[PDB]
Amino acid sequence: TNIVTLTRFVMEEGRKARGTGEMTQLLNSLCTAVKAISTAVRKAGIAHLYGIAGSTNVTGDQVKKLDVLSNDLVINVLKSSFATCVLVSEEDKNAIIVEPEKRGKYVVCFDPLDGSSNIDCLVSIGTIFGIYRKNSTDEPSEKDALQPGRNLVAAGYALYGSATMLVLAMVNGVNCFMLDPAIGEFILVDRDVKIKKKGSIYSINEGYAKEFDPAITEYIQRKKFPPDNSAPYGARYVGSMVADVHRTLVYGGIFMYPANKKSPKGKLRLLYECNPMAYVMEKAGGLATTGKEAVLDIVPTDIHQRAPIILGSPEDVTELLEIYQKHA
Numbered sequence: 001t002n003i004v005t006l007t008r009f010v011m012e013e014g015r016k017a018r019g020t021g022e023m024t025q026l027l028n029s030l031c032t033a034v035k036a037i038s039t040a041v042r043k044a045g046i047a048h049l050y051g052i053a054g055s056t057n058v059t060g061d062q063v064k065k066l067d068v069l070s071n072d073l074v075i076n077v078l079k080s081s082f083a084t085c086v087l088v089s090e091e092d093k094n095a096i097i098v099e100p101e102k103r104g105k106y107v108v109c110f111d112p113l114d115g116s117s118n119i120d121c122l123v124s125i126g127t128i129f130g131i132y133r134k135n136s137t138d139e140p141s142e143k144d145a146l147q148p149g150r151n152l153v154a155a156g157y158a159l160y161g162s163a164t165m166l167v168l169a170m171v172n173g174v175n176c177f178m179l180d181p182a183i184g185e186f187i188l189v190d191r192d193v194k195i196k197k198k199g200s201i202y203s204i205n206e207g208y209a210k211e212f213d214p215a216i217t218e219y220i221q222r223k224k225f226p227p228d229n230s231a232p233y234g235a236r237y238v239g240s241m242v243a244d245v246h247r248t249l250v251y252g253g254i255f256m257y258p259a260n261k262k263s264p265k266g267k268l269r270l271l272y273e274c275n276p277m278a279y280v281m282e283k284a285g286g287l288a289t290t291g292k293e294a295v296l297d298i299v300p301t302d303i304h305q306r307a308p309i310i311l312g313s314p315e316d317v318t319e320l321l322e323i324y325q326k327h328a
C-alpha cells in the first residue's frame with residue numbers, strides 16, 4: 001500500500017531542487033503514451049498492427065503501422081502536457097513547434113518505436129527520448145533541438161520486453177521503473193543503477209564484417225581470441241538498440257554500431273537514438289564514443305544526423321578507444 005511510482009520519484013527529485021513541476025507533467029504524460037504503446041504491442045497481431053503504413057521516413061526507413069500509432073501517441077501526450085515547445089521525432093521530417101497556448105520549457109527528441117526489424121518476430125522493441133531545456137528567448141524553432149547531448153536534462157527509454165520497463169536518467173543517476181499491468185503504474189524496481197566497470201558480452205552485427213574499420217576488426221578478434229588466455233566474451237545482438245543497450249546496462253559489456261566503409265557516420269540517429277543512450281550510460285558510469293569523440297559532445301547540424309556509437313562498460317569502451325588511438 002505505499003508504492004514508489006515514477007511520478008512520486010520525479011516529484012521528489014523536484015523536492016530536492018525548487019521551482020517548476022513541468023518535468024513531472026512531461027514525464028507523467030510520456031508514461032501515458034508508453035502504457036498505450038505497450039498495450040498495443042502486446043496485442044499487435046490480434047489488432048492487425050504488424051506491417052507497413054504507406055510511406056518512407058526521413059532516414060530511409062519503410063514506415064510500419066506501429067510507428068504511426070506510437071508517433072501520434074507521443075506527439076499528442078507531449079503537446080497536452082503543457083511542458084514542451086519543440087518536438088523532434090524520427091518519423092517527422094521537420095521539428096514540430098508546439099502551439100503557443102500549450103508551450104512549456106522543454107525540447108523533446110524521440111524515437112517513438114525503435115527496433116523496427118524486430119516488430120514482426122515479437123522481439124523486444126522500445127521508445128527512446130531525450131529532453132533539453134530551451135536555451136533562448138527567440139521563438140521556438142528547429143534550432144532549439146540542435147544541442148549537444150551534454151545539455152540533456154533527462155533521457156531514457158521504454159523497453160517493451162518480457163516486461164515493460166521505463167529507464168530514466170537525470171542529473172543525479174539512472175533509475176528503472178517497471179510497468180505494473182494491473183494498475184497501470186510504473187514502479188521503482190532498480191535504484192541508482194551503475195554499470196559494471198568491465199563486462200563479458202560484446203554486441204555488434206558481424207554481418208558487416210566486410211565493411212568494418214581495422215580497429216573494430218581487431219577488437220572483435222580480441223574478444224574471440226583473448227591474448228591472455230582469459231575466456232572469450234560471449235556475443236549477443238538482439239537487433240533492437242533498446243534491448244541491446246538495456247542488457248549492456250544491467251549486465252555490462254559493450255554495444256557497437258560503428259562507422260563503416262559505406263556509412264561514415266554509422267546508422268543510428270544522433271538526436272533520438274544515440275544521445276539518449278549515451279546520456280543513460282554516462283549517468284550509470286559507462287562511456288559512449290564514436291571511436292574518436294564523445295557522443296554527448298557532438299554539436300548536431302541536422303536533426304536527423306547519424307552518428308557512430310560504441311557504449312557500455314568503461315574498461316571495455318576504453319580498450320576499443322585504445323585500438324582506435326593505436327591505429328590513428
Ligand SMILES: O=P(O)(O)OC[C@H]1O[C@](O)(CO)[C@@H](O)[C@@H]1O
Nearest residue numbers: 114115116117205239240241242
Ligand atoms: O540490422 P542492423 O543494421 O544491425 O540495425 C539494427 C539497429 O537498427 C535499429 O532498428 C535502428 O534502425 C536499432 O534499433 C538497431 O540497433
Ligand SMILES: O=[P-]([O-])[O-]
Nearest residue numbers: 111113114115116
Ligand atoms: O526506430 P527504428 O529505426 O527501428
Ligand SMILES: [Mg+2]
Nearest residue numbers: 057061090116
Ligand atoms: Mg525506423
Ligand SMILES: [Mg+2]
Nearest residue numbers: 057061067090
Ligand atoms: Mg521510423
Ligand SMILES: [Mg+2]
Nearest residue numbers: 090111113114
Ligand atoms: Mg523508430
Ligand SMILES: [Mg+2]
Nearest residue numbers: 090111114115
Ligand atoms: Mg529508430
